[PDB]
Motif scaffolding. Structure first.
Motif: not given
Lengths: 271, 94, 46
Positions: A139, A141-142, A154-155, A159-161, A176, A193
């Motif tokens: 996981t 993000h950004n 994902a900001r 959330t998260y990717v 997401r 995350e």
RNA sequence: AGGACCGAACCGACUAAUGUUGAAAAAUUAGCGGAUGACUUGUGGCUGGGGGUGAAAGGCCAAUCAAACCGGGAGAUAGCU
RNA sequence: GCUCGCCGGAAGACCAAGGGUUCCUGUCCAACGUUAAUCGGGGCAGGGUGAGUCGACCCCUAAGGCGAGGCCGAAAGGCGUAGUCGAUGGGAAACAGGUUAAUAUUCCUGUACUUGGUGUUACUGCGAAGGGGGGACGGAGAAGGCUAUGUUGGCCGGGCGACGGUUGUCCCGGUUUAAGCGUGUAGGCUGGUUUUCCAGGCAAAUCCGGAAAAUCAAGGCUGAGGCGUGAUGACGAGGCACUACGGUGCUGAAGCAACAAAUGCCCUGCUUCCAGGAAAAGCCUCUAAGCAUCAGGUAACAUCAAAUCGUACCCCAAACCGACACAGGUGGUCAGGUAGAGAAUACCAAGGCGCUUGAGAGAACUCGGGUGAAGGAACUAGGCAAAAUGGUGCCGUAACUUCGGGAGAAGGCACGCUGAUAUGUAGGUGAGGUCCCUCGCGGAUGGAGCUGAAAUCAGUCGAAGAUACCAGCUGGCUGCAACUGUUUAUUAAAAACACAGCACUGUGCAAACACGAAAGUGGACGUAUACGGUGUGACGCCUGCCCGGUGCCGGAAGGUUAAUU
């Protein structure tokens, strides 16, 4: 955590605060402030383009490093701050050469923690490095979409990717939304995350909180006169017509994405 | 230093009133109808040349002309500039 | 009762004043028509 | 603490009477609602007419609005008076 | 001129806007003034607005506008970079008294202050379009210190009563003094000082930022108010001389203390909350180019300058916006006494008015009111309107409930005055005196003096003690909407709209969508815990069946099928 509040007025009754104790009680970092002023939903022609915006509390702008660059200098997190601009929390962070920067706050994170950007850096939450160097199944993000451009995916606040596959120059992201997307693999991402994950666990309580967040009220379409909406008018509550936008195109179901430029990157749509 | 043509241009008139005479007898000031573009240094240097007197300081004001009606037909008098000029002490003027 | 004319000379000179007319093309065509009619007062401006 | 309570300023306009060639081209009087908020107000700006704007009444946009006002086609047309 | 009445959080005084001579004086009554008019905001003539410190201007920037080039557009033009404008916000400095018929923080007197040159002498790193700091900021709440201010006493001056009493615990009046300068107090904030290094602050930087190391907790910043000075001055009740009866000239005592006290100041503080709270310049500091022993830099002094424009008058209205000398509208500032929680309300002060037709008479009827036998909603579409309730403290208070409420539920009791407790109490304030003191705007003690509820008991008056003004009617059942809100300016405020909450659906970011021939912009300096659209409308329990029809979504084997060929 959340609190409910005790219903000692109407319109206190249904509220939920999300409170966080350790957010920094006091004024933010006055280099990395700047002014942002409000649109009211109105473009340079001054017509309303996006409706239901106006008012709300005066907001400054925190300049936040998404682009995220100071590679192989360690930094240490000074503090966590509220941001009125955005749903997540920010971290004021302090590099060894004494630049301070604003990042998004990743989920684990607190004061005194150590962050490092770029290619060497140890795979803890917070760290950023290209996602040919991210191992697969993380996981993150950004997320940069173009290399060097800055984090666009994902900001917001919980959330998260997912990184599903790497084939050569590309990796594949489970977004997401539940899209699957090929992104070039020299894009950066930040581990872990994004932070303020109980942000949806607020509820607002009254109309006033929506107004302080700057949301002018939404008149639904079937209230109107038929000059004003397609849905409009009629004696009593009538609506014998397929539901549309106010410029008269279908809203339940009908897909609108037209962009043939980017369609090689979309592996699978959401469902 | 201000040109002799301009210094001879600036003063139009002494002004005659009760307030003129009382300010003259008491606080040692003349009052002048002057030119409406005339500045304080121009008035001071003009009167110091042109009556050979010593002056403390000059205050100006603008009079606005009244609006009259010559019979039916409406009509406005000119604005003009009014200078309180106090002299230095024991200067007399005619 | 708050009637409609609520004057201020800054707003008047910004809206109907002379340089406001002179800036734009049709605002000159105001001033063309008023000269050619022969108006004594050209714009609103004192 | 509170889109909390009671209540002045302030904002509003629920009821009745007067007024209806009025003191007033919507007000006065007696009561009435809110009165720390989705409040109210000053100054300036921005949005232009098939357009704006609208917590939506087809409301408002200079006492004018199911398409403002001014000028022009234009002496529109009028089997009607 | 003497009474009377009215306003007094205004119907007083002052500004901004707006107006534009309406201001003052002389003169006139044809028109204007809802009448007369000697009067006037009317006519006519003359006069009147004085600034380095007030404001504009100027420096700086917000929203926004314009916009070299540039991008786009049949033309017109649209947008926009550098810039340049744009206050309603930031940036230097004056107060007191006196004066005109009309101006005054502008004039006069006294006492200051600011910013620039110039010129000296002393000293020596100056320099920006750049870096950093600062300017620089929310709501709510809470006290503490003060002050404006008021009250009482003291003091000073005057008085001894039109009718009983009034040389006294008597009556009336005054008891004022600024800016600046000096002191630095209650308070608040902050650990300082030195040395060294450094991937940062677009280059540099001794400045900031960050790392170390040493040393001392006491150093810096900020700050109301008080005090001294300003001030042996001015002012000052009144007297005394003239008089154009309008006023003028001269003289002039006291000029203290205590208590109360702001919504004003400290406070751009402190505490708390989430909805997380302008910019740029002046200013401080750093160095870059450059200079070079010059320029410049700061220090005192001396001198010069501070231009121009507004300054009258109205300003909650007879002068502004409403056609009117119009029952209307109109932003900000000051805020006395008694009672009162109060800026309510009542009566008053200062101050200002009696609203520009009067005089009679005292029919119907109309309007605004007061009172009413007996009945008490029988009126009526309907308790419409009226009537009625109303304060504080204490007792007590139902169904139901989302446990908060309902609830001020309902209902009841005490209320004036006088004395005692207690010659004024609890409390508050707090002088001397004394002691300590690193010495003061200090710390203890000490209570003089001043102010001062609340209660109990006893007595007493009236029909009536929350006596006036002011100031909830209450309860039961039920429809609708959860609620606070919003709405048809000018016949509809509701069950209509909005709303938090819910669900569906679109949208992977140069997003969707929207305004735009386009550039461009909003969305959003946001990124699926986000945004848009649609429907529903808190919350509880839920939300059943039908895809035949119309939409929408997916599929592409076949049929049909455009331009083209």
């Amino acid at each position: 955590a959340v609190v409910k509040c005790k219903p000692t007025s109407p319109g206190r009754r249904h509220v939920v605060k999300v409170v966080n104790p350790e957010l920094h009680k006091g004024k933010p970092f006055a280099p990395l402030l700047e002014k942002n002023s409000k649109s009211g939903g109105r473009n340079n022609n001054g017509r309303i383009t996006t409706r239901h915006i106006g008012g709300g509390h005066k907001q400054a702008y925190r300049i936040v490093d998404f682009k995220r660059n100071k590679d192989g200098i360690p930094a240490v997190v000074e503090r966590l701050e509220y941001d009125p601009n955005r749903s997540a929390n920010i971290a004021l962070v302090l590099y060894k050469d004494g630049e301070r920067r604003y990042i998004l706050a990743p989920k684990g994170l607190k004061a005194g923690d150590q962050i490092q950007s770029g290619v060497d850096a140890a795979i803890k939450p917070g760290n950023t490095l290209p996602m040919r160097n991210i191992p697969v199944g993380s996981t993150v993000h950004n997320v940069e979409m173009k290399p060097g451009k800055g984090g666009q995916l994902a900001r917001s606040a919980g959330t998260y990717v997912q990184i599903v596959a790497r084939d050569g120059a590309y990796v594949t992201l489970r977004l997401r939304s539940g899209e699957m997307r090929k992104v070039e693999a020299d894009c950066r991402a930040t581990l872990g995350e994004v932070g303020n994950a109980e942000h949806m666990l607020r509820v607002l309580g009254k109309a006033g909180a929506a107004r302080w967040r700057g949301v002018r009220p939404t008149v639904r379409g079937t209230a109107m006169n038929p000059v004003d909406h397609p849905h409009g008018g009629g004696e009593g509550r009538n609506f014998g017509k397929h539901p549309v936008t106010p410029w008269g195109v279908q809203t339940k179901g009908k897909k609108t994405r037209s962009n043939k430029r980017t369609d090689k990157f979309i592996v699978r749509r959401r469902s | 230093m201000i040109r002799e043509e301009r210094l001879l241009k600036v003063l139009r008139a002494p002004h005659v009133s009760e307030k003129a005479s009382t300010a003259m007898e008491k606080s040692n000031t003349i009052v002048l109808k002057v030119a409406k573009d005339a500045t304080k240094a121009e008035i001071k240097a003009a009167v110091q040349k042109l009556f050979e007197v010593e002056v403390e300081v000059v205050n100006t004001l603008v009079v606005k002309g009244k609006v009259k009606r010559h019979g039916q037909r409406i009509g406005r008098r000119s604005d003009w500039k009014k200078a309180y000029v106090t002299l230095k002490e024991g200067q007399n003027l005619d | 009762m708050k009637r409609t004319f609520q004057p201020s000379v800054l707003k008047r000179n910004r809206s109907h004043g002379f340089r406001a007319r002179m800036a734009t093309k049709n605002g000159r065509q105001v001033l063309a028509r008023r000269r050619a009619k022969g108006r004594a007062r050209l714009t609103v401006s004192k």
